[PDB]
């Protein structure tokens, strides 16, 4: 799952499911033991923000040919884990 | 009542009654002794947010075939318990 | 006056007069000596929120057959007591 | 001037002049030496809130037959005293 | 310049020039050495609030026959002194 | 460049270029080593506020005959220096 | 990449890619180890603000003949690095 994209501060980067999302990266300021990579959760569309796919960002591919969707949100917006 | 869904931070996950709700899970940051699982309370529709049922989240079932409704809200939005 | 409904945190639960209200329950976080149960006060309709009657909440009765009206508000919204 | 109405917390209860108002009661949380009962001040209508007269509150009289007007506001909204 | 009107808390009372204003009174909570009475400054109309002239407040005169205009604002809204 | 106008608190007074501006005065509460007088910077028109020229303020001249434009803004609105 | 423009406080100055951006300068108040110059990231257009190119600011060139686009944003608005 690891690509070149990391969450900073109190943010968390998730990956949308084929909004159900999976934790991909947890910012270093998110309190320890808050959640873990791989954890599935649910966030309202209005609470998360789409993040450009690292390939598009690293100028390799075009948005259209990217299937995986990365989103971000502050950790305080996460209410649960299906864990 | 325990399914694979837990509240994090200062949130609380309730289950709507057949808005009258029952505490299902209390975030680890909610002050100790605030409330207990099983406790019944009332919250204005505008204060709570619907949470996808863990089966829908874990991709097992379809929303339509789920009867139980999970909602979440910050603990400070809870004013009372019918306890 | 005691029914199965208690105020939590910094909230206060009052009962509307036949908005003139009477303190019914004071949250454990309301500063000590702020007010007392039985105290009469006045709050603008816009500052308080209606709370479902514990019987309706505990599924015993129907809203229509309930005369007593419970409301809630944060303690900082209370400016005086007719004490 | 003392009727059964007291200011709580950081609020202050004034009485409108026949908005020019006179301090009637100072909440226990208003910093000591902020103002004194009897002090005259001026507040914009939008900063203060009307408070039901204690007789109306204590169900003795009707609003119409009350001449004295009580209002409230947070102490930080008070900029001066005509003292 | 001293009339019966004083600034409280973090407020400052100025007198509009015949918005160019002159400091008339500095609230006791305004940090020491912030400004001095007599100091001229400039504030946007939207940052200040008109204060009833102490004579009108003390019921001596009518607004129309008052030429001096008193205004108030929080000290943090003051950016400079023409000193 | 020094005229009779100084910045107070956390504000900074700049002078618009013939929005490109030059620091003219730094409030005593702006953290030490934040910037220096003479420093050129850029601020969005919406972040700054026009300040009356000290001559207009000190009632010497008319706005129309003033070419130099003074503006102010909180130091936290300054992102860079062309230094 | 170094031109005469530096980020102050908790801001960060980036350079838009030919919104994908590259860190050009990190304010001295941005927590140590937050990011590094040269790091690529993605920010929503609404979170960043355009900054005048230092040449335009230093009055050398005209906006039209500048290709490089500098933008700024608070460090807390940065969720990831394609690092």
DSSP states of C48-83 as a string? -EEE--HHHHTTSS-GGG----EEEEEGGG--EE--
C76 has a chain D CB within 8 A of its CB: yes
Fill in the DSSP letter of residue A31: P
Of G9, G49, G52, nearest to F20 by CB-CB distance is G52
Q: What tokens appear for A55 in the block? A: 């390939």
Q: Do chains B and G touch (3 or more CB pairs under 8 A)?
A: no
Q: B35-61: b or e for each residue (b if 16 or more CB lie within 10 Å)? A: beeebbbbbeeeebbebbbbbbbbeee
Of C9, C27, C58, nearest to B40 by CB-CB distance is C58
Q: Is C9–B81 a contact, with Cβ atoms under 8 angstroms apart?
A: no
CA separation (Å) from F66 to C41, F59, F62, F71?
Answer: 58, 12, 7, 14
Which 11-70 residues of chain C touch chain D by CB within 8 A?
17, 20, 34-35, 40-42, 44
Q: Is F78–G51 a contact, with Cβ atoms under 8 angstroms apart?
A: no
Contact F77, F43 (CB under 8 A): yes
Neighbours of G72 (CB within 10 A): 24
Q: Which residue has the tokens 């100025």?
A: E14
Beta-bridge partner residues of F12: F26, F73
- Nearest residue to D71 (alpha-carbon basis) of D16, D18, D29: D16
What is the least distance, in Å, from the CA of B4 to any CA of chain C?
26
- Nearest residue to F17 (alpha-carbon basis) of F34, F36, F40, F35: F40
* Chain D, nearest residue to C83 by Cα: D4
Decide the pairing of beta strands B20-26 and B40-42. antiparallel
Fill in the DSSP letter of residue E10: T
* Chain E, nearest residue to D21 by Cα: E57
Contact B14, B23 (CB under 8 A): yes
What is the least distance, in Å, from the CA of A19 to any CA of chain G?
19
* Backbone interruptions in chain F following residues (C to N > 2.5 Å): 18
CA angle C62, C68, C74 (to 5 degrees): 110
**Residue G7: CB partners within 8 Å, gap ≥ 6?**
F79, F80, G13, G24, G25, G26, G27, G30, G72
- Nearest residue to A8 (alpha-carbon basis) of G17, G28, G16, G75: G75
Neighbours of C27 (CB within 10 A): 20
Q: Is G8–F81 a contact, with Cβ atoms under 8 angstroms apart?
A: yes
The sign of the dihedral angle between the CA atoms of C21, C24, C30, C33 is positive
Fill in the DSSP letter of residue A76: G
Q: What is the C-alpha separation between B79 and C29, in angstroms, rounded?
A: 11
Q: Which chain A positions have a beta carbon within 8 Å of B59's beta carbon?
A: 17, 20
Q: Is E5–D76 a contact, with Cβ atoms under 8 angstroms apart?
A: no
* Rg of chain G in Å (alpha carbons): 12
Question: Chains contacting D with at least 3 CB pairs below 8 Å?
Answer: C, E
In the sheet that B40-42 helps form, which strands lie side by side, from edge to edge? B40-42, B20-26, B11-16, B70-74, B49-51
**Residue F36: CB partners within 8 Å, gap ≥ 6?**
F23, F26, F83
Fill in the DSSP letter of residue C6: E
Q: Which residue has the tokens 């057949």?
A: B18
The H or E element that residue A61 is part of is: none
Which among E2, E3, E5 is the top mutation candidate for probing chain D, defined by the most D β-carbons within 10 Å of its own β-carbon?
A: E5
Q: What is the C-alpha separation between B82 and C70, in angstroms, rounded?
A: 12
Q: What tokens appear for A81 in the block? A: 């884990």
**Residue D61: CB partners within 8 Å, gap ≥ 6?**
D53, D55
Q: What is the C-alpha separation between E79 and F46, in angstroms, rounded?
A: 17
Q: Which residue has the tokens 């709700």?
A: B21
Q: Which chain E positions have a beta carbon within 8 Å of D20's beta carbon?
A: 52, 56-57, 59
Q: Is D17–E59 a contact, with Cβ atoms under 8 angstroms apart?
A: yes
Contact C53, C63 (CB under 8 A): yes
CA angle B72, B77, B79 (to 5 degrees): 120
Q: Which chain G positions have a beta carbon within 8 Å of F35's beta carbon?
A: 8
Q: What is the C-alpha separation between F79 and G13, in angstroms, rounded?
A: 8
**Residue G5: CB partners within 8 Å, gap ≥ 6?**
F80, F81, F82, G13, G24, G25, G51, G54, G57, G70
The sign of the dihedral angle between the CA atoms of A71, A74, A77, A83 is positive
Q: What is the C-alpha separation between F72 and E14, in angstroms, rounded?
A: 20
Q: What is the C-alpha separation between A71 and A12, in angstroms, rounded?
A: 8
- Nearest residue to E48 (alpha-carbon basis) of E10, E67, E21: E21
What is the least distance, in Å, from the CA of A7 to any CA of chain G?
4
Coil vs helix vs strand at G30: coil
Contact C73, C47 (CB under 8 A): yes
Contact F39, F22 (CB under 8 A): yes
Q: What tokens appear for G24 in the block? A: 């050009």
Question: Chains contacting C with at least 3 CB pairs below 8 Å?
Answer: B, D
Q: What is the C-alpha separation between E22 and A51, in angstroms, rounded?
A: 52
Q: Which chain F positions have a beta carbon within 8 Å of G49's beta carbon?
A: 44, 79
> What is the four-CA torsion angle of B68, B73, B78, B80, rounded to 10 degrees?
10
* Chain G, nearest residue to F78 by Cα: G8
Contact G1, F70 (CB under 8 A): no
Beta-bridge partner residues of B40: B22
Which among D12, D18, D36, D42 is the top mutation candidate for probing chain E, defined by the most E β-carbons within 10 Å of its own β-carbon?
A: D42
Q: What tokens appear for B41 in the block? A: 């309370």
Decide the pairing of beta strands B40-42 and F11-16. unpaired
Q: Is G34–A9 a contact, with Cβ atoms under 8 angstroms apart?
A: yes
The sign of the dihedral angle between the CA atoms of C80, B31, C72, D44 is positive
Contact E12, E36 (CB under 8 A): no
Q: Is G57–F44 a contact, with Cβ atoms under 8 angstroms apart?
A: no
Q: What is the DSSP string of chain B?
A: ---S-EE-TTEEEEEE---EEEEEEE-TTSPTTS--TT-EEE--GGG-EEE--HHHHTTSS-GGG----EEEEEGGG--EE--
Q: What is the C-alpha separation between A18 and D64, in angstroms, rounded?
A: 66
- HSE (CB half, 13 Å, CA atoms) of F14? 28
CATH code of the domain occupying C1-83: 2.30.33.40
Q: Is E82–F4 a contact, with Cβ atoms under 8 angstroms apart?
A: yes
Of E17, E20, E80, nearest to F6 by CB-CB distance is E80
- Nearest residue to B27 (alpha-carbon basis) of B41, B15, B13, B14: B13
Fill in the DSSP letter of residue D28: T
Contact A66, A37 (CB under 8 A): no
Beta-bridge partner residues of G15: G22, G70
Of D40, D44, D78, nearest to E8 by CB-CB distance is D78
Q: Which chain G positions have a beta carbon within 8 Å of F82's beta carbon?
A: 4-5, 54, 57-58
User: Solved by what technique?
Assistant: cryo-EM
Coil vs helix vs strand at D45: helix
- Nearest residue to C72 (alpha-carbon basis) of C4, C14, C24, C8: C14
Q: Is B51–A42 a contact, with Cβ atoms under 8 angstroms apart?
A: yes
Neighbours of E65 (CB within 10 A): 9
**Resolution limit, Å:** 8.2
Coil vs helix vs strand at A51: strand
Q: Do chains E and D touch (3 or more CB pairs under 8 A)?
A: yes
Q: What is the C-alpha separation between F54 and D34, in angstroms, rounded?
A: 35
Phi/psi at D52 (nearest 5 deg)? -60, 135
Q: Which chain F positions have a beta carbon within 8 Å of G69's beta carbon?
A: none
Contact E42, E19 (CB under 8 A): yes
Q: What is the DSSP string of F20-75?
A: EEEEEEE-TTSPTTS--TT-EEE--GGG-EEE--HHHHTTSS-GGG----EEEEEG
Q: Is D6–C81 a contact, with Cβ atoms under 8 angstroms apart?
A: yes
Of E8, E54, E59, nearest to D34 by CB-CB distance is E8
Fill in the DSSP letter of residue D55: H
């Amino acid at each position: 799952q690891q690509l070149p994209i990391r969450a900073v501060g109190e943010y968390v980067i998730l990956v949308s499911e084929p909004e159900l999302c999976v934790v991909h990266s947890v910012g270093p300021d998110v309190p320890e033991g808050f959640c873990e990579v791989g954890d599935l959760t649910s966030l309202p569309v209005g609470q998360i923000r789409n993040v450009p796919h690292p390939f598009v960002a690293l100028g390799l591919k075009q948005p259209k040919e990217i299937k995986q969707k990365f989103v971000t949100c502050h950790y305080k917006a996460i209410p649960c884990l299906y864990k």
